[PDB]
Amino acid sequence: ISEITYSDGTVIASIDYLYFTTLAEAQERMYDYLAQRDNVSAKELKNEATQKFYRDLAAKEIENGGYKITTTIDQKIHSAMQSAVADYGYLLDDGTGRVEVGNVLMDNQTGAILGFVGGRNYQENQNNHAFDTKRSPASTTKPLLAYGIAIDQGLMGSETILSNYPTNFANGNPIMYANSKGTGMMTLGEALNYSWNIPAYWTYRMLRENGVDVKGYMEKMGYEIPEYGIESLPMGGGIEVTVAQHTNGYQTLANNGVYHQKHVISKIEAADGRVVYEYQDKPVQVYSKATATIMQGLLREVLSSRVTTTFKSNLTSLNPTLANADWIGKTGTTGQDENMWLMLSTPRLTLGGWIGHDDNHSLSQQAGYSNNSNYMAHLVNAIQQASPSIWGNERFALDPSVVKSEVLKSTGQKPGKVSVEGKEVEVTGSTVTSYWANKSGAPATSYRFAIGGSDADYQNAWSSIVGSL
Ligand SMILES: [Cl-]
Ligand SMILES: [Cl-]
Ligand SMILES: [Cl-]
Ligand SMILES: [Cl-]
Ligand SMILES: [Cl-]
Ligand SMILES: [Cl-]
Ligand SMILES: [Cl-]
Ligand SMILES: [Cl-]
Ligand SMILES: [Cl-]
Ligand SMILES: [Cl-]
Ligand SMILES: [Cl-]
Ligand SMILES: [Cl-]
Ligand SMILES: [Cl-]
Ligand SMILES: [Cl-]
Ligand SMILES: [Cl-]
Ligand SMILES: [Cl-]
Ligand SMILES: [Cl-]
Ligand SMILES: [Cl-]
Ligand SMILES: [Cl-]
Ligand SMILES: [Cl-]
Ligand SMILES: [Cl-]
Ligand SMILES: [Cl-]
Ligand SMILES: [Cl-]
Ligand SMILES: [Cl-]
Ligand SMILES: [Cl-]
Ligand SMILES: [Mg+2]
């Protein structure tokens, strides 16, 4: 009698979401094992008939085989998450029909999946929205693929200025943020807190112009993106991910830049204790510690600003002591109406959350801002009540390798002389500490001080800055 067991070795079942997710992964591991055991080549495995036979053999081996499958699942936490979506899933319903949901709770130091939500109710809809369904990550792409890489490459710091002046995509369409064609210059913090699109567009254009190996970062975290030239990649264009995979990207940022591959199976043993499969940790430093810890500070303010999510308000009410843990996160609640995301981390855990409709029809404007935020506050509370210490009371902190530059608020660069209107200007004013992940920190102010912007923008920006001296 084969048994899928929780992490602690309490049997889930002999051979709901947990069962079919565990079984599917165990079948794939058994396929690999049996093909290797039977000395089946790479070439042989490409044969569709041979693959079909080995898939069936793997299934029957699990069914008949007496294997012990050890999972990463924390039974009490996963059970609490199932109770939470049963009790509070209705809070997602926003008047666009029944809203589906996927969540993955992941240990930041290991990539172990402690629990997940597959959907509203397996008995009514079996689609697994945690592991199976691929959806655009929307504006939750920006920290990983635009800002995080730009910081890591020493192309921006925490108080760098970006253009949010109106601009068009290559196809001539304006870059929009709800009904806004844009504003003017803004800090990285304001860009992230609001999830403005134009600054993220310019950041990714800067990476492309500089020939940065973005694919190198994203593939080290297990992402599959077919076309890296898509202008809207930071806004989730040209990318579709599972919740489990995308949670793994946020795991990397939360774990001071070190990726651990997500997993739900730790081990499969034969009845006699022969190891069929064992997960092997392969940590990768995807972002520098400086980059990851700078990004943690920025994503702390995304949540505390409450601009794009009510989460901190919701959680403070449910569980003020847990709200005082060091939450960081990023929304996908502003750019688009088919997929709403909230990614949350403390130093110990990351929780990914998606909501949407199976057929991709639009959610309400505020489904991500309020409904998903309230649901995820309930889910976080349920996890803590099941396992009081699991989120932890540790703080995210800047790595000592972070470089601190005194820069002008106005330019995000060090005070000095710039040519404006044909004349040398001494640029002074209010200064701020800007965090950098390079050696030398911020450069001296240049005329084109911002990420992105047209001549005309810079004429407008410098007119205001010169006005202020
Ligand atoms: Cl389940
Ligand atoms: Cl499933
Ligand atoms: Cl056999
Ligand atoms: Cl357990
Ligand atoms: Cl997955
Ligand atoms: Cl999608
Ligand atoms: Cl343009
Ligand atoms: Cl702000
Ligand atoms: Cl690339
Ligand atoms: Cl992917
Ligand atoms: Cl490319
Ligand atoms: Cl796995
Ligand atoms: Cl997995
Ligand atoms: Cl055996
Ligand atoms: Cl490092
Ligand atoms: Cl609020
Ligand atoms: Cl957002
Ligand atoms: Cl979005
Ligand atoms: Cl649907
Ligand atoms: Cl601490
Ligand atoms: Cl320093
Ligand atoms: Cl300095
Ligand atoms: Cl440098
Ligand atoms: Cl630029
Ligand atoms: Cl212009
Ligand atoms: Mg992958």
What is the DSSP secondary-structure string of 375-440? HHHHHHHHHHHHSTTSS-S------TT-EEEEEETTTSSBSEEEEETTEEEEE---EEEEEESSSS
Query: Is 140 part of any domain?
Result: yes
Task: Assess whether 245 and 355 both reside in one domain.
Answer: yes
Q: Structure solved using which method?
A: X-ray
Do 81 and 224 share a domain, yes or no?
yes
- Give a yes or no: residue 273 inside a domain: no
What is the whole-number distance in angstroms between the Cα of residue 305 and the centre of ligand 21?
A: 27
- Its domain, for residue 23, covers 3-73
Question: What residue numbers does the annotated binding site for Mg(2+) cover?
Answer: 222, 224
Q: What is the DSSP pairing of strand 403-408 with strand 3-5?
A: unpaired
Please report whether residue 256 resides in a domain. yes
DSSP for 149-208 reads: HHHHTTS--TT-EEE-S--B-TTSPBP-BTTB---SEEEHHHHHHHT-SHHHHHHHHHHH
Q: How far is the CA of 313 from the centre of ligand 8 (A)?
A: 17
Q: Are residues 259 and 182 in the same domain?
A: yes
Inside any domain, residue 394: no
Choosing from 49, 73, 97, the residue where a domain stops is 73
Residues in the chain: 469
Q: Is residue 409 part of a domain?
A: yes
How many Cβ atoms sit within 10 Å of the Cβ of residue 312? 17
Question: Among 111, 98, 106, 99, which residue's Cα sits nearest to residue 78?
Answer: 106
Domain count, the chain: 3
Q: Nearest 5 degrees, angle CA 114-CA 328-CA 259?
A: 55
Residue 274 Cα to ligand 5 middle (Å) = 27
Cβ atoms of 390 and 108 within 8 Å: the answer is no
Residue 312 CA: which ligand is closest? 16
Report the distance separating Cα 234 and Cα 74, nearest Å. 33
Domain assignment of residue 270, yes or no: no
Distance between CA atoms of residues 456 and 448, nearest Å: 11
Which residues are 104's β-sheet partners?
Answer: 116, 352
Boundary-marking domain end, from 357, 386, 415: 386
Distance from the CA of 215 to the center of ligand 9, in angstroms? 4
Q: Which residue stretches of 232-338 are H helix?
A: 243-254, 289-305, 311-318, 320-323
Residue 123: count of CB within 10 angstroms of its CB: 7
92 and 209: one domain?
A: yes
Rounded Cα–Cα distance for residues 282 and 280 (Å): 6
14 and 116 inside one domain:
no
CA of 429 to the centre of ligand 12 (A): 54
Determine the distance separating the centroid of ligand 19 and the alpha carbon of 17, expressed in angstroms.
19
Question: At 28, which CATH number?
Answer: 3.90.1310.40
Q: Quick one: which ligand is closest to 456's CA?
A: 25
Domain shared by 69 and 102, yes or no: no
Whether 188 and 120 map to the same domain: the answer is yes
Q: Tell me the residues surrounding ligand 21 (ion) with CB < 5 Å.
A: 403-404
Per-residue DSSP letter, 113: E
Nearest to 310 by CA among 336, 329, 338: 329
Q: What is the 3-state secondary structure (H, E, C) of 52-79?
A: HHHHHHHHHHHHHHCCEEEECCCHHHHH
φ and ψ of 450, to 5 deg = -95, 160
- Taken in order 30, 36, 37, 41, the sign of the CA dihedral is positive
Say if residue 153 is in the same domain as residue 180.
Answer: yes
Binding region? 222, 224
Per the domain annotation, does 34 fall within a domain? Answer: yes
CA-based nearest residue to 337, from 357, 322, 353, 323: 357
Contact 276, 373 (CB under 8 A): no
Domain harbouring 299, CATH code: 3.40.710.10
Element (H, E) at 350: strand 349-356
- In this structure, the strands spanning 3-5 and 68-71 are parallel
Sheet with 68-71, side-by-side order of all strands: 11-14, 3-5, 68-71, 265-269, 275-278
Ligand closest to 241 (CA) is 10
174 and 97 part of one domain: yes
CA of 290 relative to ligand 15 center, distance in Å: 6
Query: CA of 166: how far to CAs of 140, 187, 188, 274, 367, in Å?
Result: 22, 16, 17, 63, 27
Q: Do 110 and 239 fall within a single domain?
A: yes
* Reported resolution, Å: 1.5
Taking the CA of 325 as reference, the closest ligand is 20
Residue 331 half-sphere exposure toward CB, CA atoms < 13 A = 32
Cα–Cα distance measured from residue 408 to residue 160, given in angstroms and rounded to the nearest whole number: 10
Distance CA(101)–CA(124), nearest Å, equals 13
Distances in Å between the Cα of 310 and the Cα atoms of 331, 370, 388 are 11, 6, 23
Residue 58 and residue 94 in one domain: no
Q: What does the block give as tokens for 250? A: 């946020």
- Whether residue 243 contacts residue 343, with contact meaning beta carbons closer than 8 Å, is answered with no
Residue 222 Cα to ligand 10 midpoint, Å, equals 6
- Residue 255 CA to ligand 15 centre (angstroms): 12
Encoded tokens for 448: 């084109």
Helices and strands, number each (H, E), in the chain: 15, 18
Q: Whose CA is closest to 235, among 368, 353, 335, 330?
A: 335
Phi, psi of 378 (to 5 degrees): -60, -45
Spatial distance between the Cα atoms of 120 and 100, rounded to a whole number of angstroms: 6
Please give the distance, rounded to the nearest whole angstrom, from the Cα atom of residue 68 to the centre of ligand 14. 10
- List CB contacts of 266: < 8 A, sequence separation 6 or more: 7, 70, 71, 72, 112, 278, 279
In a domain, 157, yes or no: yes
Q: Which of 35, 55, 73 is the last residue of a domain?
A: 73
Rounded-to-integer distance, Cα 87 and Cα 378, Å: 9
Ligand nearest to the CA of 114: 4
Report the half-sphere exposure of 132 (CA within 13 A, side-chain side).
16
Residue with tokens 């112009």: 209
Give residues with Cβ within 8 angstroms of 50, minimum separation 6: 40, 44
Q: Does one domain contain both 223 and 159? A: yes
Instruction: Give distance in angstroms: CA of 169 to centre of ligand 7.
Output: 6
In this structure, which ligand is nearest to the CA of 262? 13
